Structure of Phosphoenolpyruvate carboxykinase, cytosolic [GTP]:
Amino acid sequence: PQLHNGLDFSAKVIQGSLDSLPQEVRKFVEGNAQLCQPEYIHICDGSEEEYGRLLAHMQEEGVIRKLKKYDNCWLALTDPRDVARIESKTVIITQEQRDTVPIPKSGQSQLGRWMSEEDFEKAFNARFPGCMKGRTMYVIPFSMGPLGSPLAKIGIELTDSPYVVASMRIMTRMGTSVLEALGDGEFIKCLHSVGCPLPLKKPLVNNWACNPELTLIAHLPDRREIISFGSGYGGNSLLGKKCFALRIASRLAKEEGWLAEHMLILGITNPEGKKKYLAAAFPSACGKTNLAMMNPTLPGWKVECVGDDIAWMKFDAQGNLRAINPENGFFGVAPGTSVKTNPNAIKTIQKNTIFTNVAETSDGGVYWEGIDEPLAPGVTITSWKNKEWRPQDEEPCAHPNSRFCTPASQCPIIDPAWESPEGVPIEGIIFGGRRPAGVPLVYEALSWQHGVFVGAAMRSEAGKVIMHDPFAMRPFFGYNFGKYLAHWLSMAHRPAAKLPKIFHVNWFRKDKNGKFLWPGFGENSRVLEWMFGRIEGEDSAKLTPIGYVPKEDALNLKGLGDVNVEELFGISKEFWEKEVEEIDKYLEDQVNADLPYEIERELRALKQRISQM
Ligand SMILES: O=C(O)CCP(=O)(O)O
Ligand SMILES: [Mn+2]
Ligand SMILES: [Mn+2]
Ligand code: NA
């Protein structure tokens, strides 16, 4: 309907048709075109042609550089103001604050950031009107999870960033077939703008459009909407990555009886052909990608990657905990990725990969701190800041949060079931963190409820600072963490549910001198072997106040040197008295009225067991 000419955006569509879009998709696209005023609308088809052309166009405009050493690899260097997810500008909108975050007893909440609907509407009106003037609005239809999966969920992302389009093609399954699969079904509304309408009011830095001062990443779970403004970077712009897959999804999971978790998924096979799938939640910088793509040292063992970041998990009718990786690629921290640390990642990123904020070598290759391979004499480096770089320099050549964005299918050890619509059966869940002192290499929770507590109690070294990161979900809870705990605990009361064994690992315990007590990397397969046997009901465990640890001689330590098993598995009453006390204070403050009875009980139990040693 029109008395004039200015609501139908059909004349502005440069690929696809508004008419062919499902009713509700058209309304989403058109309504936002009316608001943001793009010059053009491009309905993404996800084709190789679309992709290659968009890359070459970004290359034309100096937005990306081609890396000539590799096969179809690209490099983007950002405005230094726009280099990471910004938690302090990340918010969830609900009617009641308590539905989003528990109300703390003493201080400020570390478990989320609530914004009122009233405050958001003002913030929105101050940002989005006219924001895409002079730019193309790209419409990205994407599936989170295998296209056929009953566990999968579909989104539509509108963006004015070609970089976002290119990265979303890698990180999700996107294009025409998603629109066709969707039909008149429900979808998550994802709206993004770099917030730099043309003509530019402010200087463009490093050909990277962004609006740091107005950056805001919002989630409206009740409206099924993600709305993000001002950042073109990673988690802020690739709206499938954290906004959808963790924040919105955890809330949907809560409603629908499943789990959306910050977990890798791997499949491990023993030398007798028996295969098990495990999930693991680690905070930042704890070797998550390393574990997911591990090359095991133990003969006859195999490790295969399903995913390295997000797990969507639901018990089936038979009581199996079925998991899918909702992503289509890996968005990994580049620095520290070497042949020693992650050889399978090295093989993956050789081809069809977008790199962000890494150094470039003079022969068109990539470089970063901790890459652990020398350059031929003559090969020079250009840093992520587009300046000549030298190993003697005080500044890093790559940004510490620099990234590779690579197709999952390219992983040489990608699991054969990684896109099976039914998902894979999880038999073990692993929590862990960086703890230089006190916390043994591996322990097993005494029960499901103790296991939930272990997840709740997670702390990790960020003078250094040890901080809480329960379930590795601290920046990602879609709703009240106490209710999230209650949601986990409720799984035990599902009849037929086969509850996975819960373990906790510490690869990072140091001796008195500051030296790691565990070699790690591929040797972590020895810990995985113990876990495997424990799931199989093997008598390989010793009871301690914190859970079960390996018996003496239970862990395969052959081929290692003289590993200090005494200091590695040592548990001190003094350390754990302090540990349980600060967990108690943290939970009381941060979770307060919403702490489930069973978590308090697990806490009392632990205090009691420690009091008796
Ligand atoms: O969201 C981002 O930009 C970073 C993703 P991660 O924190 O999993 O490396
Ligand atoms: Mn992550
Ligand atoms: Mn119970
Ligand atoms: Na740039």
About this structure: DSSP finds 16 helices and 32 strands in the chain. Residues 258-327+413-613 form a domain with the Phosphoenolpyruvate Carboxykinase; domain 3 fold (CATH 3.90.228.20).
